């Protein structure tokens, strides 16, 4: 999360975030996403230039995590948004 | 001397699929025409008795879900109503030559490995490992849940050279302990047979037959197959059972799991008992992984420190490493 704020446009330190952190997701539709899961349950959405750093244990930041989707991207991801409907 | 990037060891102690056939005790010596135990279906009307949460839980769905019966179709295998003895038969080859890999990049690393294993065999034989293998064939580890709650379990082991029988052993599985490896004359004879097999000094084919008194019409326990459960179509049926041509059976790798329970050398606790030999020595049912790589007792750590650097570990850890080479596997990067 903070790693894409001190290096918010430095993609080389995002490759360092690939070097340090844990497993990765990908999203294929009309657009294209990668998802970097972290140990603090922080998933970096990455798309071309733009990005979004998610903060779990907060449903408003998951609303912001759903602010970066097409409705075809919301044709997928529904088992990922409803997966995060527990954290209180 | 870096490690080889490709390593692969073929397994030794190759078992087969065990077949189950039921009959009557004291008709036990003529156990050759006994009919097989068949797998059949039955329906089961149960209630829903799992745990139910409190988040996103409408109590109408809750009380509507608890107060309604569940329907389901399972497979069972039972003895016939006029038979109280389970017969489980399988065979076992002992190949031998337990140091030579089947695939290796380096030639210096492979020669160093063969000098290490040949140094181990020349310093001490295969008597320890064949003694513990003889104890796992002595009792009835390969009767997993069928052993639990039985009156008398008898194991008969035959050695085969031709269309004949060379030497026959007849044991008693309940007198022989489950956790205490105590010596015996017959177990030293059969341990000399297995130890003579793993060293490459001959051909060893064994026929293992197990007998258990359970009860008239009770339930036997074959091994259970996979319904993959990929999203949709859960299906009406549940608990399908493995079989061969109209007979219930156990998988070969489960008997092979039951034979290689050697490891009494955990760092954590030697009070529980021997559980089987794995790299990162783990138990799937308990959900725990003994022998962590953060310690220095892992198979990869001991093998790297004993082949590349000549730092020989303790003797019992050397028994662990050679036990992993008899297991075989896919090693290297």
């Amino acid at each position: 999360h903070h790693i894409a704020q001190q290096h918010k446009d430095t993609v080389a330190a995002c490759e360092a975030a690939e070097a340090i952190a844990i497993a990765k997701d990908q999203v294929w539709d009309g657009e294209g996403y990668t998802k970097y899961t972290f140990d603090d349950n922080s998933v970096l959405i990455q798309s071309g230039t733009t990005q979004y750093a998610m903060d779990a244990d907060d449903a408003d930041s998951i609303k912001g995590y759903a602010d970066w989707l097409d409705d075809e991207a919301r044709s997928a991801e529904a088992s990922e948004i409803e997966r995060l409907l527990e954290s209180v | 001397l870096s490690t080889a990037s490709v390593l692969a060891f073929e397994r030794k102690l190759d078992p087969s699929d065990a077949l189950m056939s039921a009959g009557a005790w004291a008709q036990r010596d003529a156990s050759q025409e006994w009919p097989a135990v068949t797998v059949r279906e039955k329906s089961v009307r149960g209630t829903i008795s799992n745990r139910l949460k409190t988040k996103d839980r409408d109590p109408a769905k809750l009380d509507a879900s608890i107060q309604s019966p569940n329907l389901q179709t399972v497979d069972v295998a039972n003895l016939p109503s006029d038979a109280d003895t389970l017969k489980v038969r399988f065979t076992l080859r002992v190949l031998g030559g337990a140091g030579t890999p089947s695939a290796c990049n380096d030639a210096a690393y492979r020669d160093k490995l063969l000098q290490t294993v040949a140094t181990y065999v020349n310093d001490q034989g295969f008597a320890e490992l064949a003694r513990r293998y003889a104890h796992n064939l002595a009792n009835a580890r390969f009767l997993w849940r069928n052993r639990v709650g039985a009156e008398a379990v008898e194991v008969r082991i035959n050695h085969i050279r031709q269309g004949e029988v060379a030497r026959a052993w007849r044991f008693d599985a309940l007198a022989i302990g489950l956790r205490d490896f105590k010596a015996d004359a017959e177990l030293d004879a059969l341990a000399e047979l297995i130890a003579s097999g793993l060293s490459g000094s001959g051909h060893v084919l064994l026929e293992v037959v197990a007998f258990a008194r359970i009860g008239d019409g009770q339930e036997v326990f074959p091994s259970q197959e996979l319904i993959l459960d990929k999203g949709d179509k859960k299906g009406q049926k549940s608990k399908t059972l493995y079989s061969v041509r109209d007979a219930a059976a156990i998988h070969s790798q489960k008997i092979g799991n039951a034979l290689r329970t050697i490891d009494t050398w955990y760092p954590d606790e030697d009070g529980l008992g021997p559980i089987a030999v794995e790299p990162y020595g783990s138990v799937t049912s308990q959900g725990k992984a003994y022998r962590q790589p953060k310690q220095k007792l892992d198979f990869y750590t001991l093998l790297d420190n004993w082949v590349l650097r000549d730092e020989a570990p303790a003797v019992e850890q050397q028994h662990y490493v050679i036990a992993n080479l008899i297991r075989g596997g896919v090693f290297g990067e």
Partner: protein, 76 residues
């Protein structure tokens, strides 16, 4: 939002739940113990639900197996 279960007996933990969204209803095949659903289908009124459901080939729980194999159909 929840209305009722469509069948009165669960066929291996699976059952069809009927939901309400305003001017439309939502039939949804789902597991009972966990809660996660496998496929869904939207109707306009409960008269369309019962009028479609009672025209299925079967009786009793063969009808609910055909309905679960119909709503949770591979869409492509």
């Amino acid at each position: 939002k929840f209305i009722k279960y469509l069948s009165t007996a669960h066929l291996n933990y699976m059952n069809i739940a009927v939901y309400e969204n305003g001017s439309k209803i939502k039939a949804r095949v789902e597991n009972v113990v966990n809660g996660k659903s496998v496929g869904a289908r939207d109707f306009d009124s409960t008269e369309q639900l019962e009028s479609w459901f009672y025209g299925l080939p079967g009786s009793g729980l063969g009808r609910i197996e055909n309905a679960m194999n119909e709503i949770s159909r591979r869409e492509n």
